Amino acid sequence: NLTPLFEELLQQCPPGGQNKTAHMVSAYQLAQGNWMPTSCHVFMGTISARRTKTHPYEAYVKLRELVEEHKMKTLCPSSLGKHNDWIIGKIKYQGNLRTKHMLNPGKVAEQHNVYNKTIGSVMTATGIRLEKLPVVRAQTDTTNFHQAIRDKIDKEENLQTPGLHKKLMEVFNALKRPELESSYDAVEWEELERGINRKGAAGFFERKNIGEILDSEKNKVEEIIDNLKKGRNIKYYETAIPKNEKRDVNDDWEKKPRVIQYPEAKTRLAITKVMYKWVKQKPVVIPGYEGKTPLFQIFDKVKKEWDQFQNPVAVSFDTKAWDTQVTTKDLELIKDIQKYYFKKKWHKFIDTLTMHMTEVPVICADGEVYIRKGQRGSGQPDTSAGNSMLNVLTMVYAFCEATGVPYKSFDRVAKIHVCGDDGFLITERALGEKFASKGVQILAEAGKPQKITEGDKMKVAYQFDDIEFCSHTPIQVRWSDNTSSYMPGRNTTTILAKMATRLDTIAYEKAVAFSFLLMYSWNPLIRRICLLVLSTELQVKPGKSTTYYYEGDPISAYKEVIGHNLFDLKRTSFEKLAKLNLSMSVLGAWTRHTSKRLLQDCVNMGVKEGNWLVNADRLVSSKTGNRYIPGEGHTLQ
């Protein structure tokens, strides 16, 4: 009966190893009674117990007792490493973070959401009620910023199963790429400068952004590389800022933590110049890594896998606050894998870098300092590559331990896909259901707790378009050549909000409209707003600040990456569209007039003489009698 109470308690339990010297009992056995727990250290959901005359509820209080006594004896222990001493010398005032689990040695000296006016007014012309759209890209004040630190970052490292990382290395060995062993070398400045945002933010003590350092202090970046190569400490620190702050800028081309934590600009450059081939995944060596896959391609790619199983399911990876769950032992596991691929001349570089990373001085925007114990910093060059690999290994381990499949046999029964901590695997229904039910506890013990579903089971998708990945979900479309394909779907209310606002001109907006058209042409509402915005001021070229932009004609650019003409899209999946439109009605962001007013405005523009983008919309052109004849055009990043 009280099996669920025990299963709840068993994920508070400290992870332990296998105990052959005693009886290991599960939550079922404890609930049955006549089992007396001798230790709260959990191993694969089992506890050491003693046969006795014990009623169930009494056994629960013993375990709960144990779990609390152990928690009392390990909640507030640490020395500062010598290489981090320098930060103490910059402290000027006493600290007020009030951290409980990490040192707040003090404070060093000190050092908006607006509308896209064209996109926004097209929406309003339609009767879309902007003030009813969800809030996106919200900023946070210093007070809630420091609370987020206290809430998420201020913690002890997760305890993990003894010998866990040995086993995760055994998984790695089952998927390494031996032809690449000990081959990675640094890259040239020219190759680095090709894929780099020159606006990459400066760190707390820095003044110049990435571009300015490139142009004028390349020797400072090389002094850092030289120090690390030789095993010598650098002054490593990360800067904390709240999400959507001015320095919340991406180095490379929503899921971010509330607390961005990033290395200096000179330092991000030192790491990338040496560790390029791994942090950029050139080539891809992490199985199922979708970091380079365009969002308009991913679900088509995944469906071909889905179609080869007999009764496929997909099991979602959903780790609570992943970056705060990364342990020193996790980072060293990634260090060891990096050393596998890199030439030996860079091993001491990787050792020293990783060492700096296990205890990181972090400086808040306002100057407060905390010493972070392990964990991942949002802004590190190795976030995507390091988190993806750690996610893959951990999930393959967990699936294999839950199902009994051997690590070397994973590739035979499942497909995995990851984008950092985000991912899922496809496998046969029986395997997937076993993993979903037993994964929660195994991954708790591995130090990667899940956001657990009703019933404490992992989320399982029994039909393809129930998969969740990168905040999107498959939705099918029907083309006029009698084929079907899949596009990245997402709630209309969310798409509208994202398209309608930015953080602090026409050329930008048309870059956005194009970008959104590439992802959301399955959504008639979004598609028609896009075409109206692209119809604005045809003489101004699109900006290049966003995900994509077009050279020449946007409609032809679309056809180049999507594989059909916009005008060939004849149907969007009726059921799924209804799901993704639901919130529009719940929130009252549209009315009964909104689709017809938007279509009418498109028709009014397209009936007139000339060559109008809006006539690339199959239904708009059907009502106007005119088509769009498109020029040349190409999509660019």
Header resolution in angstroms? 3.0
Cα 590 vs. chain centroid, distance in angstroms?
31
Q: What are phi and psi of 503, to 5 degrees?
A: -100, 125
From CA 160, how far away is CA 133, in angstroms rounded?
A: 42
Which residues contact residue 325 at a Cβ distance below 8 angstroms, ignoring those fewer than 6 apart? 158, 319, 375, 447, 448, 449
Q: How was this structure determined?
A: X-ray
Number of CB atoms found within 10 A of residue 281's CB: 17
Do 374 and 328 form a contact (C-beta atoms < 8 A)?
Answer: yes
DSSP 358-415: HEEEEEETTSEEEEEES---TT-TTHHHHHHHHHHHHHHHHHHHHH---GGGHHHHEE
From CA 158, how far away is CA 375, in angstroms rounded?
A: 10
Per-residue CA distances from 154 to 76, 101, 197, 531, 578 (Å): 11, 6, 31, 47, 42
Do 117 and 501 form a contact (C-beta atoms < 8 A)?
Answer: no
Do 548 and 635 form a contact (C-beta atoms < 8 A)?
Answer: yes
The closest of 391, 418, 254 to 323, measured between CA atoms, is 391
Quickly tell me which residue has 């910023």 as its tokens: 145
Which residues contact residue 288 at a Cβ distance below 8 angstroms, ignoring those fewer than 6 apart? 392, 415, 416, 417, 418, 423
Q: What are phi and psi of 226, to 5 degrees?
A: -65, -40
The pair of three-digit structure tokens given for residue 608, joined into one six-digit string? 């007139």
Helix, strand, coil tally for the chain in percent (to 5): 45, 15, 40
Cα 538 vs. chain centroid, distance in angstroms?
36
Which residues contact residue 54 at a Cβ distance below 8 angstroms, ignoring those fewer than 6 apart? 33, 34, 35, 36
Q: Give me the amino acid identity at 50.
A: R
DSSP-derived letter for residue 588 is: T
The closest of 551, 559, 566 to 511, measured between CA atoms, is 551
From CA 6, how far away is CA 24, in angstroms rounded?
A: 14
- What domains can be seen in the chain, in order of their start residue? 3-72 (no CATH), 164-461 (3.30.70.270), 473-636 (no CATH)
- Please tell me the number of Cα atoms within 13 Å of 114 on its side-chain side: 8
Do 281 and 291 form a contact (C-beta atoms < 8 A)?
Answer: yes
Residues preceding gaps in the chain (C to N > 2.5 Å): 77, 111, 253, 504
Q: What are phi and psi of 284, to 5 degrees?
A: -75, 125
Number of CB atoms found within 10 A of residue 284's CB: 16
Long-range contacts of 65-70 (CB under 8 A, 24+ apart): 66/37, 66/39, 66/40, 67/9, 67/12, 67/13, 67/14, 67/40, 70/14, 70/40
The pair of three-digit structure tokens given for residue 214, joined into one six-digit string? 């490139």
Q: What are phi and psi of 289, to 5 degrees?
A: -80, 115
Q: What are phi and psi of 114, to 5 degrees?
A: -120, 160
